[PDB]
């Protein structure tokens, strides 16, 4: 059981920020890190909980749900990654346990 979730937000008809993902997923556990990126013309993210059960719970409860009315559908699966490596704290990535990270390459 991996504590890391792979997320895809489909029907992105309104922007979804990293902070909004933190808000939604924090209802099921302690979110340690999040990284977002765009690949294959799809908005994706990796999110790490401290507890694998929290990840399981969030997947069961949130998969297929729309973040906002009529858009932004969550497609959630488990990642094989055991943890996440975050280098910066900015609009695309965040390590909630490391407040000293720079916002971009030095």
């Amino acid at each position: 059981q991996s504590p890391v979730l792979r997320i895809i937000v489909e029907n992105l008809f309104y922007p979804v920020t990293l902070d909004v993902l933190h808000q939604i997923f924090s209802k099921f556990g302690t979110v340690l890190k999040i990284i977002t990126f765009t690949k294959n013309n799809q908005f994706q993210a990796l999110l790490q909980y401290a507890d694998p059960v929290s990840a399981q719970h969030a997947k069961l409860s949130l998969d297929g749900q729309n973040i906002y009315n009529a858009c932004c559908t969550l497609r959630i699966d488990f990642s094989k990654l055991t943890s996440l490596n975050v280098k910066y704290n900015n609009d695309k990535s965040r390590d909630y346990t490391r407040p000293d990270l720079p916002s971009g390459d030095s």
Partner: peptide, 8 residues
């Protein structure tokens, strides 16, 4: 209908 309703 959705988790957060209308956008911020």
């Amino acid at each position: 209908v959705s988790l957060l309703g209308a956008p911020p």
